[PDB]
């Protein structure tokens, strides 16, 4: 249910600064989520899957 | 490259300024002013003249007596041996009376000299306070310096006088000596269970750091706009110039807000004054109210907890 | 007996109350210049809405000037002053671009307020900042070179002129400006000490701020024997404009 | 007015604002339902 | 919003990196290239600090995890990891946050350089801020590097880092005798006196006694000549204050840099070179 | 009924940017708070613990 | 009182609103944190069950 | 007094109102915390029940 | 603001505040039934 | 005469101020009665 | 035993600043004395009178 | 006389490229999580 | 499934400035990703593969 | 094919100096990384321990 005049948001919010804000936030957010996930049981690098490489050698 | 306005490259000279005339009742100033070329590289080349009325004369007399009583006892403590006095200078001190004497006047041979040095330095400082007040009065200036000085005197008074009396013993005051007064500082923290956990110690640190923060900011800011006469803060305050405008915008653009040429000196004034206000309160509460700051911090839920990787059997329990 | 509340805890809370009151006090003092703020909310509200933040502005204080100089009030209503620039983009938060030749635009680091058209005074009431020709009691400190007669060079090493006199602070003795007789037009213009490096062995004053040819347009003094606050700021701002405007490389960026 | 918006401009922004806010709250309710179904916390 | 005199200074250009791409303000803040970069380092570092608080030292379910403001602590790795990267949950989180902080700090200073370029003012403030950055980097980079492990860095916890300071200090028995530490403290103390002296004098001459006009430069010089027989001058007091504050920071860095890398015994015993001189 | 007139008092742009900033911060805060607790869905070994496989 | 409306001739309506919103949001966060610091904590009460025990 | 109203000729009503409001909120927050640090604490008193035990 | 403008704001402000207080009351009744605290 | 308000405006502001403050004090009294019934502290 | 011309003190000291200062001084003194009294035997909040409410639960 | 300087047509034009570009980004996000859910389901 | 007028992004962001920002971001991202991976079981420097060279001496 | 046009928009001289400064740091960085691992070639006592010769 998007409003027909939602495009008018760019009459209030500046494109370049909005674009910069989105890119910056998402990079920070993507880096954060990876480091959150890595610091849990969901960790995909040290799970010795498919094999452990410090054990193998 | 550019001129950084750190050193005066070309000094000029004019006949020495005798000072703004003072009202009747003030004594004439004394001294023939001289010029130091090398002081003139970093600041004002004129040394002197000086004002010295009864207040400052009495202050200096008390202060010279106090300083000499200290030095005499230092020299006596290496048996007049001047070479050993120089060898051990940083270690020597004039020691407070033993605890057995309480707040009573102790013997000349065992603490009387400390109490006399403490009395006369204290009176010397109090008279110096009056001097700062009178010199502003004679110039028609407000009393900001003497108010800030009173805050420092408060802290000084708490360390050596108020707390020892509250604790009933001159033995709890500070010895006069370089390294000896450092012993006192460390021992005080040990005795009272780690001064890091005293919240007024934490505040005093915040304000001491802030003073260096604020003077670095302000010192650097003014030199960067001194090309616009920004060091002339009186007329920048009454008649805002591009110096004061550019300074505020540098900080507004950096951290989102800014002050004025006048009001930075209020931030600076309060930051410096609160350093010694909180310090006095922190010491005033140590021994009198809180005996172990760590356990006080534990009690109010502040002390960090760590995984146990070392531990020791208490042989007093066994 | 035992109690959770103790005097150390009471006192530290009392400090926070004092401290936050102090912070609001200080923030009020901070708003005696530059406020209320120029916003696009005040434009569209037709002036109904003044942007001042929190806390609000203090009641005005008065500064009484010596020698019957008048009264200054703070905060004060200041008339809007036109900006000699046009926006790089119409979007809010965009910089502006100086009109015309940037050196002469009075915009950016070339900008300055309109300070009073009178001279700062000594305690005794004389013009504070004056050339050594007028304050004949001044001399150069022994050991340092006399700047008079030194050659003034611009940022590109070209000869801009000669030091024709030295302007000193009579209240607190120091050089504040060098007087430069500009070769190109034979006009005498002030040069702030803040923009001057001495090369003592060469007897040259180097000015990195502007080119030699830029000295022709240093703002001129209405009266050659004194300097008004107004003229002091216009002079200093013109040199400062060169820091950003005097060459193309100075616009940036590095990469 | 204090915002510069006309009376008709405030009705228009309000209609889009309220429409967008209700939509956002609808997403919030859906998320708390899924979270309640997967892991009830009360 | 802008200061009522600000618009005439909002000039285009003067960037070091970025040019027109990021050359804009966000409310009062100037952004620019180092504004964008610094914001990312900062938000990441802050959010990773909060994540470390969320999981605590041994997982979010343990009794050691806490959001108590004094007790939150993110700690560096064990010394056994040397100069390598530890696992995120074993100090690596601290290691990433440190790099964010350094990047956040250095980006802040370079942004300041761009602001100075816009305003045509001197570069003293970012230059002075570099001393604080250097001290942070001495603490987390140079000194750990010279001793061989990032774990010599201090932990990021409001009270836990005071425990670090305490235990590092007492490794030298009586840290008060560190000569660079004594010198640095003298600068810290002298700076505070000088700051109160400067603040007082400016407020007292611009706010004189009732009925008095604003006082003059002659009053300022006379006033301290009357008290101490010397006046340094209104420009030089700002020179002095910057020198004292920067000297305090510099000798701080020196005093911790020599504690471990260039001295391992008690600090009082250092003074035995003095005591053992063949004069006495 | 005249609640739309709120946009004659409060700036619509300023309200929007404030809501976005507040909501992102509050949203991040709540995830972290819930993750500090028993409700944690990342470290619950549900549906299984993947480190116990290696 | 009948003339209570005249308070908006004294206090800026725009500012009062903004102050209420800011105060209430901070107060709401404060009260939750206080309650969560107490026995009343509804997040770590293992009610209806401990989900970490389920794993 | 019958002319006590003349206090609004010496004190700014706008400033006095805001100061009272600010004072009352701070006092209210301060007093609640004081009472929470005494025997009168009503949140962690396990009355009517301790919710951490019942779960 | 004019006198008529102040009455209009006051009428809308009071209904909005009582409505907000209504949600506050509902939240506490829900909270009281789930977890009575006195 | 020193704050700007007329003598009538001060009588009118005082009247509303006193009724407002008495109303606030009434709310304060009600809360302390409820507090005394639930948890008498003296 | 009061003077008749004592009202002339308000020709010497600013009445606005006197009233404000009195209000400030009284509010602070009141906070201080309560905490002084709280830190003595007269303490009325944590005295378990009429009863201890923590011991009640 | 808009606040951003954009005309009405430009806002429409920017909005259409912005919406299309954001959906593509979110689409990649959905694919990443589908792959992640297939590889390592976390609920 | 791109937008045929995606090139118009260079009418909003200065293209020469975006290049410098991308290159320095990528260098710092590469540094971060190596460090993170080096903190894990996938570590290729300390895995004693093919052999441990400290055990040779 | 038009990659040389990069030097019409980025000043060649500072690109060079950035590369030189970057390379020297990276070189120091990589050595200190290598040295802090099993590949360390200074304290591996290969071909011999010169200290043990004492
Ligand atoms: C045991 C002690 C031993 C001490 C030994 C000392 C030895 C010397 C002894 C002799 C002492 C003589 C004292 C002076 C004599 C008379 C001087 C004089 O000329 O008077 C006329 C003097 C001048 O009149 P004027 O017309 O104002 O002239 C001013 C000029 O025009 C120019 O004025 P201006 O425009 O610059 O303005 C002046 C300035 C005024 O500043 C000062 O002058 C004094 C500076 C303070 C110095 C003391 C430090 C205070 C420490 C407090 C922290 C303690 C922690 C606990 C907190 C408790 C408080 C709650 O304005 C401000 O800075 C405003 C400050 C606002 C205060 C903080 C704001 C918040 C307050 C609370 C807010 C509400 C709370 C709840 C809020 C809720 C929401 C958050 O009268 C004054 O108004 C100024 C008063 C200052 C003089 C007395 C106070 C300072 C001197 C004593 C300091 C002692 C320090 C020791 C502290 C101990 C620890 C607690
Ligand atoms: C509260 C702040 C929010 C106020 C507000 O409504 O702002 C909206 C305002 C817009 O409203 P507007 O329509 O322009 O209205 C004009 C304002 O009313 C303009 O009104 P204004 O100029 O009245 O407002 C200024 C306001 C706005 O300022 C800001 O935007 C930045 C705010 C940063 C606050 C920092 C506080 C630090 C506290 C640290 C915690 C420790 C406290 C102390 C602990 C004990 C220490 C002793 O800043 C403040 O009010 C706080 C300044 C005072 C802080 C005092 C801290 C003292 C600490 C102790 C020091 C020791 C003193 C010794 C004596 O500004 C913004 O939207 C900011 C946009 C955010 C941009 C973020 C991204 C920036 C990217 C580049 C940077 C990368 C990083
Ligand atoms: C078990 C867990 C899974 C896993 C689960 C997920 C999931 C689930 C997701 C990711 C996502 C990402 N993962 Mg992962 N991830 C795993 C392991 C890894 C590892 C690793 C070392 O192990 C790495 C390096 C990555 C890397 C990444 C990124 C490619 C991506 C986040 C990009 C981002 O935030 O952009 C920040 C965003 C922006 C900048 C905005 C969008 C950019 C658009 C395309 C256009 C911008 C161009 C603009 C003009 C210029 C930009 C340059 C600027 C100058 C800076 N994954 C493992 C195997 N990963 C996300 C993803 O792929 O997103 C689609 C995602 O949803
Ligand atoms: C068991 C507990 C659940 C859980 C319970 C909830 C609940 C309950 C909610 C969320 C919500 C959110 N969760 Mg969660 N969440 C879980 C796991 C995760 C994980 C993870 C790594 O495991 C992540 C990254 C997230 C991330 C998020 C966000 C997508 C969203 C908050 C956005 C916000 O703050 O808006 C602030 C920003 C704005 C208001 C800006 C304006 C709107 C813009 C234009 C759109 C932004 C994107 C939007 C959120 C689309 C996502 C909707 C999806 C249906 C989730 N959840 C677990 C599995 N999560 C919230 C949500 O979806 O709200 C609707 C919410 O209420
Ligand atoms: C047993 C204890 C209960 C509990 C007891 C209470 C009580 C009691 C109250 C709240 C209130 C609220 N709680 Mg709680 N709360 C619980 C758990 C949570 C959790 C969580 C992670 O578990 C969260 C995030 C919240 C969040 C919230 C907010 C939605 C709300 C306060 C917002 C505010 O301050 O507005 C400040 C903002 C403004 C004044 C802005 C202007 C108003 C605008 C127009 C309305 C905004 C949206 C509105 C708040 C939506 C919800 C009302 C419904 C009744 C839910 N609750 C637990 C389960 N919660 C309060 C509330 O709902 O008030 C009505 C309240 O009084
Ligand atoms: C045993 C101890 C009691 C207790 C003892 C008391 C006592 C006794 C009093 C309060 C009062 C208050 N308590 Mg309590 N309080 C308890 C538990 C709580 C808890 C909680 C999480 O448990 C909360 C959030 C509160 C919250 C509050 C506020 C509603 C109120 C303070 C407002 C104020 O400062 O005004 C400052 C703001 C202003 C002056 C602004 C102007 C007033 C405006 C116009 C009115 C705003 C709405 C108003 C606050 C509505 C409440 C009145 C009702 C009669 C309750 N109480 C426990 C159960 N509480 C006070 C009170 O009700 O005051 C009447 C009071 O005297
Ligand atoms: C060199 C003399 C002194 C000095 C000067 C100095 N500092 C300065 C400046 C100058 C000239 C600035 O221009 C600059 C400024 O803009 O001030 C307003 C700054 C500044 N000095 C600051 C702080 C400060 N300076 C300190 C010290 C000093 N600064 C000196 C003693 C200290 C001390 C002693 O501890 C601190 C707390 C900031 C107010 C500001 C720099 C602001 C900044 O860089 O912002 C970007 C970063 C953030 C907003 C936060 C980043 C968060 C990180 C990514 C995560 C956190 C990691 C951190 C290591 C955790 C620490 C946790 C625990 C230790 C609690
Ligand atoms: C250094 C000594 C400077 C000095 O000694 O200068 C003297 C003046 O002293 C005078 O005013 C008095 C000079 C006293 C001031 C000297 C410096 C004091 C310390 C200043 C530094 C600040 C102190 C710390 C503050 C934080 C020289 O004058 P006379 O001694 O009169 O001799 C000249 C005769 O021929 C007169 O005909
Ligand atoms: C031989 O030497 C000559 C004569 C040539 C001169 C040389 C002097 C020298 C070299 C002196 C060296 C001095 C040094 C190195 C001093 C170092 C001092 C330090 C570091 C002191 C630090 C702190 C001291 C403090 C804080 C002391 C505070 C003491 C107080 C406040 C004591 C107050 C006591 C009072 C008010 C006593 C009152 C007595 C009553 C009234 C109670 O009597 C009943
Ligand atoms: Ca794997
Ligand atoms: Ca001793
Ligand atoms: Ca899971
Ligand atoms: Ca629960
Ligand atoms: Ca209860
Ligand atoms: Ca009782
Ligand atoms: Ca390998
Ligand atoms: Ca080898
Ligand atoms: Fe200054």
Distance from CA of F10 to the nearest CA of D (A): 6
Q: Count other Cβ atoms within 10 Å, centred on residue H42.
A: 16
Same domain, E206 and E251: yes
Does ligand 4 lie within 6 Å of residue F41's CB atom?
yes
Pocket probe mutation, ligand 3, options A32, A34, A44, max atoms within 8 Å of Cβ:
A34
Q: With an 8 Å Cβ cutoff, are L3 and C89 in contact? A: no
Q: How far is CA B78 from the centre of its chain?
A: 30
Does ligand 4 lie within 6 Å of residue D31's CB atom?
yes
For residue L40, the chain A residue with the least C-alpha distance is A42
Q: Is E213 part of any domain?
A: yes
Task: Quote the domain boundaries for residue E215.
Answer: 172-271
Q: Round to whole Å and give the CA distance between N30 and N52.
A: 29
Q: Which two tokens stand for residue G44?
A: 């770590």
Cross-strand bridge partners of residue C182: C161
Say if residue E198 carries a ligand binding annotation.
Answer: yes
The ligand minimizing its distance to the Cα of D41 is 13
Distance from CA of C62 to the nearest CA of K (A): 18
Q: Residue E91: left if φ>0, alpha if ψ -120 to 50, beta else—which one?
A: left
Q: With an 8 Å Cβ cutoff, are A15 and C93 in contact? A: no
- Per-residue b/e over E125-135, b at no fewer than 16 CB within 10 Å? bbbbbbbbbbb
Q: Round to whole Å and give the CA distance between C129 and C14.
A: 50
Nearest to M56 among N9, N33, N44 (CB): N44
Same domain, E109 and E89: yes
Same domain, E2 and E65: yes
CB-CB neighbors (< 8 A) of E11 in chain C = 85, 95-98, 107-109, 244
Q: Is E276 part of any domain?
A: no
Q: Round to whole Å and give the CA distance between E266 and F7.
A: 69
- Look-up: residue for tokens 């061989």? E148
Say if residue G12 carries a ligand binding annotation.
Answer: no
Share in percent of chain F as helix, strand, coil (round to 5): 55, 0, 45
Same domain, E180 and E112: no
What one-character DSSP code corresponds to residue E116?
H
Q: With an 8 Å Cβ cutoff, are C46 and D4 in contact? A: yes
In a mutational test of the E interface, the residue from M17, M28, M31, M41 whose CB has the highest number of chain E CBs within 10 Å is M17
Q: Round to whole Å and give the CA distance between F39 and G55.
A: 12
Strands C204-206 and C151-153: parallel
Separation in Å, CA C109 to CA B230, B247, C93: 15, 12, 18
Q: How far is CA G28 from the centre of its chain?
A: 2
**Do the two chains K and F touch, given a threshold of 8 Å on CB pairs and at least 3 pairs?**
no
Atom of ligand 2 nearest to the CA of C22: 64
Q: Which two tokens stand for residue B222?
A: 């003014």
Q: With an 8 Å Cβ cutoff, are K43 and C10 in contact? A: no
Residues of C with CB under 8 A from a CB of N: 254-255
Task: Tell me the three state secondary structure of residue C179.
Answer: strand
Q: With an 8 Å Cβ cutoff, are E84 and N37 in contact? A: yes
Q: Which domains does chain I have, with CATH numbers?
A: 1-38 (1.20.5.250)
The ligand minimizing its distance to the Cα of A56 is 16
Which residue, E104, E136, E171, sits at the end of a domain? E171
Same domain, E13 and E125: yes
Size of interface A-M (CB pairs under 8 A): 33
Q: Round to whole Å and give the CA distance between F51 and M40.
A: 13
Does ligand 4 lie within 6 Å of residue F50's CB atom?
no
CB-CB neighbors (< 8 A) of G10 in chain H = 13-14, 17
Same domain, E186 and E149: no
Residues of M with CB under 8 A from a CB of N: 16, 19-20, 27, 45-48, 52-54, 56-57
Note whether I21 contacts G: Cβ–Cβ < 8 A. Answer: no
Residue A49 phi, psi (nearest 5): -115, 125
What one-character DSSP code corresponds to residue C83?
-
Q: How far is the centre of ligand 15, averaged over its atoms, from the C-alpha of K44 (Å)?
A: 5
Q: Round to whole Å and give the CA distance between C205 and C150.
A: 6
Give the torsion sign (CA, E171, E175, E180, E185): positive
Q: Where are the alpha helices (DSSP H) in chain K?
A: 15-38
Q: Round to whole Å and give the CA distance between B100 and B98.
A: 5
CA gyration radius for chain M?
21
Same domain, E56 and E134: yes
Residues touching ligand 1 (Cβ under 6 Å) are B 126, 129, 142-143, 147, 150-151, 153-154, 157, 277, 280; C 14-15, 17-18, 20-22, 25; E 203, 207, 210; H 22, 26; K 28
For residue E158, the chain B residue with the least C-alpha distance is B304
Q: Round to whole Å and give the CA distance between E65 and E157.
A: 13
Note whether D1 contacts C: Cβ–Cβ < 8 A. Answer: yes
Say if residue L37 carries a ligand binding annotation.
Answer: no
The closest alpha carbon to C253, from E130, N14, A19, M27, belongs to N14
Does ligand 9 lie within 6 Å of residue B72's CB atom?
yes
C255 CB-contact burial (10 Å; exposed 0-12 / middle 13-18 / buried 19+)? buried
Task: Tell me the three state secondary structure of residue D26.
Answer: helix
Distance from CA of G36 to the nearest CA of D (A): 14
What one-character DSSP code corresponds to residue F19?
H
CB-CB neighbors (< 8 A) of C91 in chain A = 14-17
Same domain, E130 and E57: yes
Say if residue I32 carries a ligand binding annotation.
Answer: no
Q: Round to whole Å and give the CA distance between H6 and B186.
A: 60
Q: Round to whole Å and give the CA distance between B215 and K15.
A: 39
3-class secondary structure per residue, chain B: CCCCCCCCCCCEECCCCCCCCCCECECCCECCCEECCCHHHHCCCEECCECCCHHHHHHHHHHHHHHHHHHHHHHHCCCCCHHHHHHHHHHCEECCCCHHHCCCCCCCCCCHHHHHHHHHHHHHHHHHHHHHHHHHHHHCCCCHHHHHHHHHHHHHHHHHHHHHHHHCCHHHCCCEEHHHHHHHHHHHHHHCCCHHHCHHHHHHHHHHHHHHHHHHHHHHHHHHCHHHCCCCHHHHHHCCCHHHHHHHHHHHHHHCCCCCCCHHHHHHHHHHHHHHHHHHHHHHHECCCECCHHHHHHHCCCCCCCCCCCCCCCCCCC
Which residue, E155, E171, E187, sits at the end of a domain? E171
Q: Which two tokens stand for residue B249?
A: 């915008």
Separation in Å, CA C207 to CA C104, C246, E233: 18, 12, 25
Assigned superfamily of C110-251? Photosynthetic Reaction Center, subunit H, domain 2 (3.90.50.10)
Q: Round to whole Å and give the CA distance between C211 and C153.
A: 8
Same domain, E14 and E150: yes
The ligand minimizing its distance to the Cα of N47 is 17
Note whether M40 contacts L: Cβ–Cβ < 8 A. Answer: no
Q: With both helix axes pointing from N to C terminus, report the angle between M15-38 and E92-119 in degrees, rounded to the nearest 10.
A: 160
Q: Which two tokens stand for residue C147?
A: 């700047």
Pocket probe mutation, ligand 7, options E129, E161, E238, E241, max atoms within 8 Å of Cβ:
E129
- Look-up: residue for tokens 């671009």? C97
Residues of N with CB under 8 A from a CB of M: 6, 9-10, 22, 33-34, 37-41, 44-46, 49
Indicate the resolution in Å.
2.9
Q: How far is the centre of ligand 3, averaged over its atoms, from the C-alpha of M6 (Å)?
A: 21
Residue E242 phi, psi (nearest 5): -70, -40
Q: With both helix axes pointing from N to C terminus, report the angle between B199-224 and B263-285 in degrees, rounded to the nearest 10.
A: 160
Does ligand 8 lie within 6 Å of residue E230's CB atom?
yes
The closest alpha carbon to B50, from M2, A50, E126, E230, belongs to E230
M45 CB-contact burial (10 Å; exposed 0-12 / middle 13-18 / buried 19+)? middle
- Look-up: residue for tokens 């979010």? E60
Q: Round to whole Å and give the CA distance between B172 and B188.
A: 9
Question: Measured between alpha carbons, how far apart are the two ends of chain G, in Å?
Answer: 62
Atom of ligand 4 nearest to the CA of F39: 1
Protein residue with least CA distance to atom 9, ligand 7: E129
**E strand or H helix at E201:** helix E179-206
Method for this entry? X-ray
Pocket probe mutation, ligand 8, options B16, B47, B49, max atoms within 8 Å of Cβ:
B47
Is-cis flag, bond preceding C55, omega within 30?
Answer: yes
3-class secondary structure per residue, chain G: CHHHHHHHHCCCHHHHHHHHHHHHHHHHHHHHHHHHCCCCCCCCCCCCCCCCCCC
Same domain, E210 and E232: yes
Separation in Å, CA B92 to CA B72, B84, B175, B178, I22: 11, 10, 10, 7, 74
Q: How far is the centre of ligand 16, averaged over its atoms, from the C-alpha of A34 (Å)?
A: 25
Give ion ligand 15 contacts, CB < 5 A. Answer: J 41; K 47, 49
Give the torsion sign (CA, B233, B237, B241, B243): positive
Does ligand 4 lie within 6 Å of residue D23's CB atom?
no
Note whether E159 contacts N: Cβ–Cβ < 8 A. Answer: no
Distance from CA of F36 to the nearest CA of I (A): 22
Does ligand 2 lie within 6 Å of residue E25's CB atom?
no
CB-CB neighbors (< 8 A) of F31 in chain D = none
Same domain, E28 and E143: yes
Q: Which two tokens stand for residue E200?
A: 């007082």
Cross-strand bridge partners of residue E72: none
Q: Which domains does chain N have, with CATH numbers?
A: 3-53 (4.10.220.20)
């Amino acid at each position: 249910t998007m409003n027909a005049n939602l495009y008018k948001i760019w009459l209030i919010l500046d494109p370049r600064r909005v674009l910069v804000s989105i890119v910056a936030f998402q990079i920070v957010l993507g880096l954060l989520i990876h480091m959150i996930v890595l610091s849990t049981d969901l960790n995909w690098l040290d799970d010795n899957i498919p094999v452990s490489y410090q054990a193998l050698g | 490259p550019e001129y950084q306005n750190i050193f005066t490259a070309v000094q000029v000279r004019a006949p020495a300024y005798p000072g703004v005339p003072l009202p009747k009742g003030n004594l004439p100033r004394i001294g023939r002013p001289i010029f130091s070329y090398w002081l003139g590289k970093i600041g004002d080349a004129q040394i002197g003249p000086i004002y010295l009325g009864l207040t400052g004369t009495l202050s200096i007399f008390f202060g010279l007596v106090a300083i000499s009583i200290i030095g005499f006892n230092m020299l006596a403590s290496v048996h007049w041996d001047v070479f050993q006095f120089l060898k051990h200078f940083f270690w020597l001190g004039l020691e407070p009376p033993p605890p057995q004497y309480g707040l009573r006047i102790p013997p000349l041979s065992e603490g009387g000299w400390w109490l006399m040095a403490g009395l006369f330095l204290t009176l010397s400082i109090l008279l110096w306070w009056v001097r700062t007040y009178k010199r502003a009065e004679a110039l028609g200036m407000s009393q900001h310096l003497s108010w800030a000085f009173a805050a420092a005197i408060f802290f000084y008074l708490v360390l050596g006088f108020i707390r020892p009396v509250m604790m009933g013993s001159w033995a709890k005051a500070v010895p006069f000596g370089i390294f000896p007064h450092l012993d006192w500082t460390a021992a005080f923290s040990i005795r009272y269970g780690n001064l890091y956990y005293n919240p007024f110690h934490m505040l005093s640190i915040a304000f001491l750091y802030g003073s260096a923060l604020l003077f670095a900011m302000h010192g650097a800011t003014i030199l960067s706009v001194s090309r616009f006469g920004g060091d002339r803060e009186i007329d920048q305050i009454t008649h805002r110039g591009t110096a004061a405008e550019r300074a505020a915008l540098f900080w507004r653009w950096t951290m989102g807000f800014n002050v004025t040429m006048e009001s930075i000196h209020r931030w600076a004034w309060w930051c410096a004054v609160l350093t010694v206000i909180t310090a006095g309160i922190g010491i005033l509460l140590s021994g009198t109210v809180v005996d172990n700051w760590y356990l006080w911090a534990v009690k109010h839920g502040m002390a960090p907890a760590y995984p146990e990787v070392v531990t020791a059997v208490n042989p007093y329990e066994t | 007996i035992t109690h959770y509340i103790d005097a150390a805890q009471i006192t530290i809370w009392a400090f926070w109350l004092f401290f936050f009151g102090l912070i609001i006090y200080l923030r009020r003092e901070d708003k005696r210049e530059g406020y209320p703020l120029d916003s696009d909310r005040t434009e569209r509200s037709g002036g109904r809405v003044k942007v001042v933040g929190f806390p609000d502005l203090p009641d005005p204080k008065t500064f009484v000037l010596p020698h019957n100089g008048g009264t200054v009030v703070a905060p004060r209503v200041e008339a809007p002053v036109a900006v000699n620039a046009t926006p790089f983009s119409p979007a809010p938060g965009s910089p502006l671009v100086p009109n015309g030749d940037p050196m002469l635009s009075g915009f950016g680091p070339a900008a300055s307020p309109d300070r009073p058209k009178h001279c700062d005074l000594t305690f005794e009431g004389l013009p504070k900042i004056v050339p050594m020709r007028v304050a004949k009691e001044f001399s150069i400190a022994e050991g340092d070179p006399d700047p008079r007669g030194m050659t003034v060079v611009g940022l590109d090493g070209e000869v801009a002129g000669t030091v024709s006199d030295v302007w000193v602070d009579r209240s607190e003795p120091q050089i504040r400006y060098l007087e430069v007789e500009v070769a190109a037009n034979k006009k005498k213009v002030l040069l702030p000490i803040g923009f001057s490096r001495f090369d003592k062995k060469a007897r040259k004053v180097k000015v990195d701020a502007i080119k030699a040819a830029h000295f022709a347009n240093v703002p001129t003094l209405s009266n050659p024997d004194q300097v008004t606050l107004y003229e002091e700021d216009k002079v200093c701002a013109y040199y400062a404009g060169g820091k950003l405007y005097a060459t193309a490389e100075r616009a940036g960026p590095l990469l | 007015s204090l915002t510069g918006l006309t009376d008709d401009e405030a009705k228009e922004f309000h209609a889009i604002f309220m429409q967008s806010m209700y939509a956002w709250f609808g997403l919030v309710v859906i998320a708390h339902l899924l979270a309640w179904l997967y892991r009830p916390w009360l | 919003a802008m200061l009522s005199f600000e618009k005439k200074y909002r000039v285009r250009g003067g960037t070091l990196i970025g040019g027109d791409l990021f050359d804009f303000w966000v409310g009062p803040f100037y952004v620019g290239f180092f504004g964008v970069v610094g914001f990312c380092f900062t938000l990441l570092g802050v959010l990773l600090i909060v994540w470390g608080a969320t999981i605590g030292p041994t997982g979010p379910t343990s009794d050691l995890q806490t959001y108590n403001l004094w007790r939150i602590s993110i700690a560096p790795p064990d010394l056994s990891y040397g100069l390598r990267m530890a696992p995120l949950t074993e100090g690596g989180l601290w290691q990433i946050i440190t790099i964010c902080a350094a990047g956040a700090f250095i980006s802040w200073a370079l942004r300041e350089v761009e602001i100075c370029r816009k305003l045509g003012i001197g570069f003293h403030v970012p230059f002075a801020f570099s001393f604080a950055i250097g001290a942070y980097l001495v603490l987390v980079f140079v000194r750990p590097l010279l001793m061989g492990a990032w774990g010599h860095g201090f932990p990021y916890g409001i009270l836990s880092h005071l425990d670090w300071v305490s235990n590092v200090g007492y490794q030298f028995l009586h840290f008060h005798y560190n000569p660079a530490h004594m010198l640095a403290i003298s600068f810290f103390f002298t700076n505070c006196l000088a700051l109160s002296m400067h603040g007082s004098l400016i407020l007292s001459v611009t706010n004189p006694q009732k009925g008095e006009p604003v006082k003059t430069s002659e009053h300022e010089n006379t006033f301290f000549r009357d008290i101490v027989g010397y006046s340094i001058g209104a420009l030089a007091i700002h020179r002095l204050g910057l020198f004292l504050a920067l000297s305090a920071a510099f000798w701080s860095a020196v005093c911790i840099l020599i504690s471990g890398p260039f001295w391992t015994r008690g600090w009082p015993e250092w003074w035995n070179w003095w005591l053992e001189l063949p004069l006495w």
